[PDB]
Amino acid sequence: KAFHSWHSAESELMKKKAAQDKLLRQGKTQQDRLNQVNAEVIDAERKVHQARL
Amino acid sequence: ARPTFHITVGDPHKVGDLATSHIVYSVRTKTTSKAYKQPEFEVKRRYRDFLWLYNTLHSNNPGVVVPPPPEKQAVGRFESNFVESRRAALEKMLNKIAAHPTLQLDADLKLFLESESFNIDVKHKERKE
């Protein structure tokens, strides 16, 4: 499970990140959702890191 | 640089009658300021953008001043003079703010003066939204 959780932190992380990218490469980008999504991305990366560590 | 920001507000693309119509000015920033990207940019702002903007300056600067706006039509008509007042009002507002390093630092304002698309789309873009 710890592993599991960990990856879960990642898989999600990736999603938020991906979303960011999408807004970004919508081209126009709501910088609003970009920021929100990004905030979550960095946390998620951390989550990945932590659960893993 | 901060006071050494050079501003001409010209080009009174005064959108013709509507009884509320809004003059769009070149805002040429010729700026040696390193608080302004472009050594020259011209944007073509309309009254509404500025007022907001002015408010933005108000908003980003928590007590940290925001002098008077572009001129009010609250007594103004749409007179060349009035619009001039607006032009001036901005010029002034802008002038000062530029010679205040902080209000001159509003990023919206950099983008605003240094990009024509109005305050608005700049303002989304800046909070990454």
Side-chain angles (χ1 to χ4, degrees), chain B residues 1-5 7 33 35-36 50 53-58 61 64-70 89-106 109 112-113:
Chain B
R2 306 305 175 264
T4 331
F5 173 66
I7 177 73
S33 198
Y36 287 107
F50 307 111
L53 176 265
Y54 166 61
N55 316 141
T56 324
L57 308 169
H58 218 143
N61 304 111
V64 199
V65 66
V66 274
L90 288 154
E91 161 284 311
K92 171 185 60 152
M93 161 191 109
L94 292 163
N95 163 296
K96 294 160 174 301
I97 60 191
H100 302 141
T102 312
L103 289 313
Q104 194 186 6
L105 291 195
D106 301 319
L109 173 68
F112 197 56
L113 279 170

Side-chain angles (χ1 to χ4, degrees), chain A residues 20 29-35 38, chain B residues 121-129:
Chain A
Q20 203 174 296
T29 325
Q30 278 174 297
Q31 183 196 80
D32 152 61
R33 302 286 158 216
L34 197 81
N35 176 269
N38 184 262
Chain B
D121 312 294
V122 167
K123 187 50 190 175
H124 307 107
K125 285 168 182 61
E126 54 211 49
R127 305 142 293 163
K128 71 176 299 185
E129 66 194 79

Side-chain angles (χ1 to χ4, degrees), chain A residues 9 12 14 20 34 43:
Chain A
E12 289 72 275
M14 294 149 150
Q20 203 174 296
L34 197 81
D43 287 292

